């Protein structure tokens, strides 16, 4: 993912592409949640705007994607008009690397590696001004410091190969470890963790990030190229029109597989099982289309789901984000083989609750109650100013879920089923930790996100949602 340049101005991007690039050379950069794709064509530079309001990356004059990496993979392998993406123009900046610590002292580094690190835990820090230091833990346990010289724009450890960036140096010494005079192997197994905080410390960490949040978010984004898993099933011709956005697809390994279909390609839904890994599970899905309503109810039936979380209005800015897949209050409707009764609707301030009864037609004893929590007050763009509303909603949802024996995964959807959907699920996972363990437990916001993003692509879209998750968790701790 070297083609993303986090601290480059438009003019710097142009000059870099004109002096170090060729035609088909490209880079991506941040602007507010806006990004630019800069490409060289006919010895000139075209800047393509990519917007993200919270739901997806919307490439102007192109399509919608779950991640910038999936956007770059799509155009490199394929469509882009006023433009070919051929050569990634590599960024040499280490700011968004998990191993980079910038201004950090030797003793501070050793203390961090002693308290937080294990065998193979490493970091890169500033030194000899201009130079760098590789501090690595092995194991009795020990910390070893290796001097990184910066010489005429290249990096080296005293001899051998001179590297164009700290990243190339680290990737080379990761695969080819340094061996010490007395036989110690300086294995670079994993970067030092800096984001795992204790829940009681939330407020302090949030004061630090508010000075921050952007840097911590971009380092998480720099890990998305590890999550380019296969999405073949959504790509099939017969599944294309089952997707709200042609390129926003489920991963094959965690997709919900629909069984007992009408006897051609009856097993597909744009949905992924989200299993927290470190008690409830989730199904993150898109808002139904007219042609997927029946599939949606087939999923809820098969997965034994007793609770649905809807985090969008049906219509936002005159565009359908989700079709009404539930009957009118007191009405009964059939969706293929599935029968659904809207028993009662209860209107709260931030949401509506719909009590539904789902059963299979021809078998009356298959009936079960599905509780639909329709969160109605999320802003059209951005995130709520206060997390209180989202928090009371999740507490109601949790308690409903817990009150039902053998209830299947909680169904969560918005429009694409990645941004608001990811935000609510990650808030829910983190608050579940704090509910059963209290203030005395470790929480790691970007690690939980990366774990959820490995199950459905693009979970948690913006820096605004990222910060909102931290505000929600801090608020939940504050009100215990």
UniProtKB/Swiss-Prot annotation:
Any Gene Ontology biological process: hormone-mediated signaling pathway
Resulting phenotype, residue 446 to S: In NS1; increased phosphatase activity
Effect of residue 272 to S: In NS1; some patients also manifest giant cell lesions of bone and soft tissue
Keyword 4Fe-4S: no
Effect seen on changing residue 56 to D: In NS1; also in Noonan patients manifesting juvenile myelomonocytic leukemia
Active site (record annotation): 414 (phosphocysteine intermediate)
GO cellular component: cytoplasm; cytosol; mitochondrion; nucleoplasm; nucleus; protein-containing complex
Taxonomic superkingdom: Eukaryota
UniProt KW keywords: Acetylation, Cytoplasm, Deafness, Disease variant, Hydrolase, Nucleus, Phosphoprotein, Protein phosphatase, Repeat, SH2 domain
Keyword Transferase: no
Outcome when changing residue 458 to R: In NS1 and JMML; JMML patient also shows growth retardation and pulmonic stenosis
One Gene Ontology term of the molecular function aspect: signaling receptor complex adaptor activity
Record note on what altering residue 55 to V does: In JMML; also in myelodysplastic syndrome
Phosphotyrosine: residues carrying this PTM: 56, 60
Function per UniProt: Acts downstream of various receptor and cytoplasmic protein tyrosine kinases to participate in the signal transduction from the cell surface to the nucleus. Positively regulates MAPK signal transduction pathway. Dephosphorylates GAB1, ARHGAP35 and EGFR. Dephosphorylates ROCK2 at 'Tyr-722' resulting in stimulation of its RhoA binding activity. Dephosphorylates CDC73. Dephosphorylates SOX9 on tyrosine residues, leading to inactivate SOX9 and promote ossification. Dephosphorylates tyrosine-phosphorylated NEDD9/CAS-L.
Annotated disorder: LEOPARD syndrome 1: A disorder characterized by lentigines, electrocardiographic conduction abnormalities, ocular hypertelorism, pulmonic stenosis, abnormalities of genitalia, retardation of growth, and sensorineural deafness.
Protein family (similarity comment): Belongs to the protein-tyrosine phosphatase family. Non-receptor class 2 subfamily.
Protein name: Tyrosine-protein phosphatase non-receptor type 11
Organism of this sequence: Homo sapiens (Human)
Name of the gene this protein is made from: PTPN11
């Amino acid at each position: 993912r070297r083609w993303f340049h986090p601290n480059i101005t438009g003019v710097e991007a142009e000059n870099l592409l004109l002096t170090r690039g060729v035609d088909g050379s490209f880079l991506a950069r941040p602007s507010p949640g806006d990004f630019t794709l800069s490409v060289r064509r006919n010895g000139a530079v075209t800047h393509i705007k990519i917007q993200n309001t919270g739901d997806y990356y919307d490439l102007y004059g192109g399509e919608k994607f779950a991640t910038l990496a999936e956007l770059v993979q799509y155009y490199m392998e394929h469509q882009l008009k006023e433009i070919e993406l051929k050569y990634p123009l590599n960024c040499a900046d280490p700011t968004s690397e998990r191993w980079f610590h910038g201004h950090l002292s030797g003793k501070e580094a050793e203390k961090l590696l002693t308290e937080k690190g294990k065998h193979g835990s490493f970091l890169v820090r500033e030194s000899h001004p201009g130079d760098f230091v590789l501090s690595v833990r092995t194991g009795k346990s020990k910390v070893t410091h290796v001097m990184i010289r910066c010489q005429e724009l290249k990096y080296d450890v005293g001899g051998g190969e001179r590297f164009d960036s700290l990243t190339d140096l680290v990737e080379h010494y990761k695969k080819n470890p340094m061996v010490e005079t007395l036989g110690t192997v300086l294995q670079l197994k994993q970067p030092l963790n800096t984001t795992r905080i204790n829940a009681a410390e939330i407020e302090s960490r949030v004061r630090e990030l508010s000075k921050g949040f952007w840097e911590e978010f971009e380092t998480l984004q720099q890990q998305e190229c590890k999550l380019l898993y296969s999405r073949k099933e959504g790509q099939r011709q017969e599944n294309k029109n089952k997707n709200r956005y042609k390129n926003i697809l489920p991963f094959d390994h965690t997709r919900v597989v629909l069984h007992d279909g009408d006897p051609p390609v009856s097993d597909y839904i744009n949905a992924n099982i989200i299993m927290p890994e470190f008690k409830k599970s989730y199904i993150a899905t898109q808002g139904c289309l007219q042609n997927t309503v029946n599939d949606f109810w087939r999923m809820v039936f098969q997965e034994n789901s007793r609770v649905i979380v809807m985090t969008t209005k049906e219509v936002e800015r005159g565009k359908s984000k989700c079709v009404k897949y539930w009957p009118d209050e007191y009405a009964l409707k059939e969706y293929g083989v599935m029968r659904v009764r809207n028993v009662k609707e209860s209107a709260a301030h931030d949401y509506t609750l719909r009590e539904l009864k789902l059963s299979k037609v021809g078998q009356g004893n298959t009936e079960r109650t599905v509780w639909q929590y329709h969160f109605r007050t999320w802003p059209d763009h951005g995130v709520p100013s206060d997390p209180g509303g989202v928090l009371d909603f999740l507490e109601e949802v949790h308690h409903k879920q817990e009150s039902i024996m053998d209830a299947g995964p909680v169904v969560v959807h918005c429009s694409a089923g990645i941004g608001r959907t990811g935000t609510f699920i990650v808030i829910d996972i983190l608050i579940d930790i704090i509910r059963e363990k209290g203030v005395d437990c470790d929480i790691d916001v970007p690690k939980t996100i990366q774990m959820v993003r490995s199950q459905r692509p693009g979970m948690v879209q913006t820096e605004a949602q990222y910060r909102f998750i931290y505000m929600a968790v801090q608020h939940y701790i504050e009100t215990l």
